[PDB]
Structure 1
Amino acid sequence: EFLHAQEEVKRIQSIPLVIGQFLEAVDQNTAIVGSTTGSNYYVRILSTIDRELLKPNASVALHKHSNALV
């Protein structure tokens, strides 16, 4: 089951993602992004996206539906 869950996470980090600008980090595993659609969202960050690299105003792909930063 652990392997299945890992595979599901790897999947939700999918291909058709939407580009956007990560604007800042609000808390752990959540942050504000502005999608190239022109709207700003308060989305949830997946785990282990190198929060060290995740600096304000950074290009990031977003889940097409949930807008989660993945």
Structure 2
Amino acid sequence: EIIDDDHAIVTSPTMPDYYVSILSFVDKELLEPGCSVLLHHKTMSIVGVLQDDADPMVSVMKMDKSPTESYSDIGGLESQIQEIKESVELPLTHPELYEEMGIKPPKGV
């Protein structure tokens, strides 16, 4: 967590936690809690950030482009796939229709 007072509460590889000072570099705003951060070893202070959840999980999760599958290349269960589109796709493309009815858009399938 960040406490606005130029201090933070960090966990390292080693088991006890540390009431550390932020010392210069990254501003409190530019930090996000839950991020992986850079500590100087001799005195543990936040000397920056560059890591940003450097972890294989982050690798697997992120996918900025759209998937390899384009639509109804898949053959049959047409009706089925045109049910998943009513709930998901339709509110993101147009919430207008939902507003006009007076009902919350469906969320989730």
TM-score w.r.t. the length of structure 1 is 0.55
Structure 2: which amino acid aligns with 1:39? P
SS of 1:31's partner is strand
The sequence identity of aligned pairs, in percent, is 49
Is 1:63 aligned to 2:11, yes or no? no
Is 1:34 aligned to 2:8, yes or no? no
Q: Structure 1 unaligned runs (5+)?
A: 1-23
In the TM superposition, residue 45 of structure 1 has moved relative to its aligned partner by: 0.3
Query: C-alpha offsets along residues 19-48 of structure 1, whole Å, 9 cap, x if unaligned?
Result: xxxxx1112321111112222101000124
Q: Compare the two structures and name the one with the higher helix fraction.
A: 2
SS of 2:36's partner is strand
Preserved contact between residue 30 and residue 42 of structure 1 (Cα < 8 Å): yes
C-alpha separation in 1, matches of 2:37 and 2:25: 14
C-alpha separation in 2, matches of 1:49 and 1:43: 14
TM-score w.r.t. the length of structure 2 is 0.38
Which contiguous aligned blocks of 4+ residues in structure 1 show a shift greater than 3 angstroms? none
Question: Which structure would you say has the larger RCO, counting Cα contacts within 8 Å and 6 or more residues apart?
Answer: 1
Specify the structure having the higher radius of gyration (Cα). 2
SS of 2:31's partner is coil
